[PDB]
Design an enzyme around this catalytic site. Structure first.
Site, PDB file in Angstrom:
ATOM      1  CD1 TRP A  78      49.064  41.254  12.983  1.00 49.09           C
ATOM      2  CD2 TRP A  78      47.856  41.188  14.873  1.00 49.09           C
ATOM      3  NE1 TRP A  78      48.748  42.549  13.331  1.00 49.09           N
ATOM      4  CE2 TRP A  78      48.015  42.535  14.488  1.00 49.09           C
ATOM      5  CE3 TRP A  78      47.135  40.905  16.031  1.00 49.09           C
ATOM      6  CZ2 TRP A  78      47.469  43.594  15.220  1.00 49.09           C
ATOM      7  CZ3 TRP A  78      46.603  41.966  16.765  1.00 49.09           C
ATOM      8  CH2 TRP A  78      46.770  43.287  16.350  1.00 49.09           C
ATOM      9  CG  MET A 124      51.527  38.268  20.092  1.00 50.03           C
ATOM     10  SD  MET A 124      51.452  39.979  20.618  1.00 50.03           S
ATOM     11  CE  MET A 124      52.016  39.797  22.295  1.00 50.03           C
ATOM     12  CD  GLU A 133      51.149  43.962  22.509  1.00 44.33           C
ATOM     13  OE1 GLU A 133      52.077  44.566  21.915  1.00 44.33           O
ATOM     14  OE2 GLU A 133      50.285  43.271  21.918  1.00 44.33           O
ATOM     15  CE1 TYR A 134      54.148  41.895  24.467  1.00 42.34           C
ATOM     16  CE2 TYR A 134      55.615  43.781  24.195  1.00 42.34           C
ATOM     17  CZ  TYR A 134      54.884  42.742  23.645  1.00 42.34           C
ATOM     18  OH  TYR A 134      54.876  42.551  22.276  1.00 42.34           O
ATOM     19  CE1 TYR A 183      52.788  39.068  16.158  1.00 43.41           C
ATOM     20  CE2 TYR A 183      51.753  37.054  15.399  1.00 43.41           C
ATOM     21  CZ  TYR A 183      51.696  38.228  16.113  1.00 43.41           C
ATOM     22  OH  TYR A 183      50.547  38.574  16.798  1.00 43.41           O
ATOM     23  N   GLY A 185      43.972  46.729  24.765  1.00 43.53           N
ATOM     24  CA  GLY A 185      45.408  46.846  24.921  1.00 43.53           C
ATOM     25  C   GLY A 185      46.092  47.041  23.583  1.00 43.53           C
ATOM     26  N   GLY A 186      47.138  46.257  23.340  1.00 41.57           N
ATOM     27  CA  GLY A 186      47.962  46.419  22.158  1.00 41.57           C
ATOM     28  C   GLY A 186      49.169  47.295  22.452  1.00 41.57           C
ATOM     29  CD1 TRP A 187      53.852  49.800  20.304  1.00 42.73           C
ATOM     30  CD2 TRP A 187      54.857  47.990  21.161  1.00 42.73           C
ATOM     31  NE1 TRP A 187      55.153  50.141  20.589  1.00 42.73           N
ATOM     32  CE2 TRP A 187      55.792  49.048  21.114  1.00 42.73           C
ATOM     33  CE3 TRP A 187      55.265  46.750  21.659  1.00 42.73           C
ATOM     34  CZ2 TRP A 187      57.104  48.902  21.545  1.00 42.73           C
ATOM     35  CZ3 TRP A 187      56.571  46.609  22.087  1.00 42.73           C
ATOM     36  CH2 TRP A 187      57.474  47.678  22.027  1.00 42.73           C
TER      37      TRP A 187
END
Length: 375
Positions: A337, A186, A120-121, A188, A77-79
């Site tokens: 991260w 997450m 995400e997401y 941040y 996954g990831g953004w």
């Protein structure tokens, strides 16, 4: 038993000279888990994102050879990956189940200790249910495998957002909490180059003068919101960034929180993204001439400015302070991260991995214990 889950970004291997980070660079004693990001989906199956990755997977695993208690996970996954592949993954049971059975084989083949899921997401009721079914199916199959199989169960974790609005929109908290081994919050990217005012990447507490909404954009409020929605504290791993976010100031004389900004700050020579700096890049910024370092005693984090350049970041002192908050609240550990952006070469003038070291030393002796903590 506080846990320390460190992300390792695949693309860190592509950075220039000293920036270049390889699995070998990982101190296998720092973290309890190393999560390698990111694999991808191809034909709705877990697969290596680039042909060069397989050798990297091999290198990350086998850190183990140097610390046999270290767990190694693979993240999908990831953004950038976005929501659509996850939606298509979970659109029918056969695809979903076959993804599940093959993912297990993929993971066992590389000898990974488990899977980190970074959708995400999810957003909306259909996504919410789909995310639950996906986690539910992974978890049950992981167990079922451990019994029909030989060894210890594959671990299941997920990176989840800090925004209280994203939490409502995407996350059936009590349900996902049954199936996940770790919930990596997450905490941040609360502020950055998408805004036109200066603000800190990861403030622990808010400014006393903050609007009721700005008060929610903090590590403390986000983590508490996860608790309030039902997340078990021992599974909650609070995100700790080893990077900062930078701004170009409209007016050099206006450098306080909220000062006008036209965009991101000048990129670091290694990460090549305006608005963003790794910690070793921060240290470089700090040793320029005339750069003033400030400690924000309300937010409990540092920032620095020199001429029209402003950067908000985390250092040894802010991370230690966060660990003190962490233990007081009773969370289960931290997520980092990322490991490749801590000063892994010791070029800041303190030791190697000064950020993660500082957190780890402050966590020494901490035992997590659940107890009534009021409303």
């Amino acid at each position: 038993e506080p846990q320390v889950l460190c992300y390792l970004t695949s693309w860190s291997s592509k950075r220039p000279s000293a920036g270049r980070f390889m699995p070998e660079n990982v101190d296998p004693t720092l973290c309890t888990h190393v999560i390698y990001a990111f694999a991808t989906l191809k034909d709705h199956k877990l697969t290596e994102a680039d042909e060069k990755d397989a050798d990297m997977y091999d290198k990350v695993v086998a850190l183990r050879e140097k610390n046999p208690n270290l767990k190694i996970l693979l993240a999908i996954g990831g953004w950038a990956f976005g929501s659509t592949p996850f939606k298509e993954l979970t659109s029918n049971v056969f695809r979903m189940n076959q993804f599940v059975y093959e993912a297990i084989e993929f993971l066992r083949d590389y000898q990974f200790n488990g899977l980190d899921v970074d959708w995400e997401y999810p957003r909306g009721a259909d996504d919410r249910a789909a995310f639950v079914s996906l986690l539910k199916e992974l978890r049950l199959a992981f167990e079922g495998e451990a019994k029909t199989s030989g060894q210890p169960r594959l671990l299941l974790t997920a990176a989840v957002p800090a925004s209280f609005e994203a939490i409502a929109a995407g996350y059936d908290v009590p349900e996902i909490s049954k199936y996940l081994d770790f919930i990596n919050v997450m905490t941040y990217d609360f502020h950055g180059q998408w805004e036109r005012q200066v603000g800190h990447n990861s403030p622990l507490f808010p400014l006393e003068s903050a609007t009721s909404y700005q008060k929610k954009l903090t590590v403390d409020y986000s983590a508490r919101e996860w608790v309030r929605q039902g997340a078990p504290k021992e599974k909650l791993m609070i995100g700790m960034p080893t990077y900062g976010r930078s701004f170009t100031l409209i007016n050099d004389t206006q450098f306080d929180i909220g000062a006008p900004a036209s965009g991101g700050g000048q990129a670091g020579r290694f990460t090549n993204e305006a608005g963003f700096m790794s910690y070793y890049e921060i240290c470089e910024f700090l040793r320029e001439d005339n750069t003033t370092l400030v400690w924000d005693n309300e937010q409990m984090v540092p920032f620095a400015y020199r001429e029209d350049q402003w950067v908000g970041f985390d250092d040894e002192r802010s991370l230690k302070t966060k660990m003190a908050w962490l233990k007081e609240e009773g969370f289960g550990g931290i997520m980092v991260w990322s490991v490749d952006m801590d000063d892994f070469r010791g070029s800041c003038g303190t030791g190697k991995y000064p950020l993660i070291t500082a957190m780890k030393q402050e966590l020494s002796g901490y035992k997590v214990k659940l107890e009534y903590d009021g409303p």
